[PDB]
């Protein structure tokens, strides 16, 4: 019937709407003490508006990106070269922790893109308050690898790359990406890839010869 998505499962929350994005958490299940801890969510990024309602039993976040932002599946339709550049910007955005209590969960359902293929997150956690509510660099690294493979290689869904990559049809650069030790080595693998792919696209505007 209705399976919960990776986001839903990791947040233990319900996506009740996608127009506009709306996430519903049970207050009883949160580490949140003072609802004021969630005010930081008003200050994630100037493009995407987030309205927060802390009621006696639930916390509701309503997330409204600009109407001209592109979904993950829209970027998946662009050129390989373009998708790898997008993936580089993603890895560059999450490479570090926030100093302002914000914690990032990376998956295709949680991302939208601006006109310059800059990624933005929809839902963001708050340390010790709202899931994801703790750092876990390993979890973030795996999500990023799966999300980047889903965007670039794109021969499987995010969940399948995430969950199952040791059992599926691994490609050479993909293999390099899973292999990578940390986000910087993910970024190095991508950089050699975008160079390779840029040389290929350029060859298409010269006629040898
Ligand atoms: Cl050229
Ligand atoms: Na750590």
Numbering used by the authors: 2 to 210
How is this structure described in the published paper?
The membrane-bound EssB is an integral and essential component of the bacterial type VII secretion system that can contribute to pathogenicity. One of these is EssB, a 50-kDa bitopic integral membrane protein that is conserved among T7SS gene clusters in Firmicutes. The architecture of Geobacillus thermodenitrificans EssB has been investigated by combining crystallographic and EPR spectroscopic methods. The protein forms a dimer that straddles the cytoplasmic membrane.
We determined the crystal structure of EssB-N using a construct comprising the entire predicted cytoplasmic fragment (Ser2 to Asp214). The structure of EssB-N was determined at 1.7 Å resolution. The asymmetric unit consists of a single polypeptide folded into an elongated structure, approximately 55 Å long and 35 Å wide, which consists of two domains. The N-terminal domain is dominated by a four-stranded antiparallel β sheet. The C-terminal domain consists of a helical bundle formed by two antiparallel helix pairs, α4/α5 and α7/α8. A cleft, approximately 30 Å deep, is formed between the two domains, blocked at one side by the interdomain connecting loop that links β4 to β5. The EssB-N segment resembles the bilobal structure of ATP-dependent protein kinases, i.e., an N-terminal domain or N-lobe with a β sheet packed against an intersecting α-helix, and a predominantly α-helical C-terminal domain (C-lobe; Zoltner et al., 2013). An overlay provides a Z-score of 10.4 and a root-mean-square deviation (rmsd) of 4.4 Å for an alignment of 173 Cα-atoms. These values suggest a distant evolutionary relationship but the catalytic residues are absent from EssB-N. However, at the C-terminal inner surface of the EssB cleft, as well as at the domain contact area, a remarkable degree of structural similarity is evident (Zoltner et al., 2013). The transition to a monomeric state appears to be influenced by a combination of low pH and high ionic strength, which matches the crystallization conditions used for EssB-N where we may have been selecting out the monomer.
